[PDB]
């Protein structure tokens, strides 16, 4: 059929559906027939984003090795790189990093980077990959949290361990004055408060509320019991 030439189209196109299904040929036919490889859906999404988020590697390569615009931002500031990471698609994130020449520290609207996203969904090897290829662990989301704070909030020690082995500040604090240990206590993440204590995290540090990590844990929690055993062994 015919593709009207448009300035800013705000309507989903067949390319999106094809992209989202990962059908490489239909994509080709459409592109070859005039389809704008970068059209935006009503919710501001590019076919590349559709193909990325749905783990369709070959269709991601095609769109890319065909002019696909790559730093389009979501309606909430996410790029295809965020989306693929958020879903933990290793290969897509890989290609988007190497052959796609994209920015690993791109931050969406909430301040989050792909690593904070892969941390939120506990995609270990994706955090490894993002580190191995340039992640700046000092990035601070809009509320002063650096990746470690969320590794803490989440509870995944393997991601928390990995971020520390990357020279990440164990005492960095967000807009509330909370440190990673403060968080790992409130959310009752035992294994985490243990790794943290094992790396000398100040149990006496108060936040902007006056609370210390020990004062943030719930009473008689596994975490409370650990944090106190600690404060006592410190006072001794």
UniProtKB/Swiss-Prot annotation:
Q: Which superkingdom does the taxonomy of this entry point to?
A: Eukaryota
The listed locations are: Nucleus; Chromosome
**Segment Histone H3K9me binding: which positions?**
143-145
Q: Found in which tissues?
A: Widely expressed.
Disease tied to this protein: Kleefstra syndrome 1: A form of Kleefstra syndrome, an autosomal dominant disease characterized by variable intellectual disability, psychomotor developmental delay, seizures, behavioral abnormalities, and facial dysmorphisms. KLEFS1 patients additionally manifest brachy(micro)cephaly, congenital heart defects, and urogenital defects.
**UniProt record similarity statement:** Belongs to the class V-like SAM-binding methyltransferase superfamily.
Entry note about domains: The ANK repeats recognize and bind RELA subunit of NF-kappa-B, when RELA is monomethylated at 'Lys-310'. They also specifically recognize and bind H3K9me1 and H3K9me2.
Could you tell me what this protein does? Histone methyltransferase that specifically mono- and dimethylates 'Lys-9' of histone H3 (H3K9me1 and H3K9me2, respectively) in euchromatin. H3K9me represents a specific tag for epigenetic transcriptional repression by recruiting HP1 proteins to methylated histones. Also weakly methylates 'Lys-27' of histone H3 (H3K27me). Also required for DNA methylation, the histone methyltransferase activity is not required for DNA methylation, suggesting that these 2 activities function independently. Probably targeted to histone H3 by different DNA-binding proteins like E2F6, MGA, MAX and/or DP1.
**Protein name in UniProt:** Histone-lysine N-methyltransferase EHMT1
Q: Please report the organism this UniProt entry assigns to the protein.
A: Homo sapiens (Human)
> What gene does this protein come from?
EHMT1
- The residues of the intact protein that this chain contains are 765 to 998 of 1298
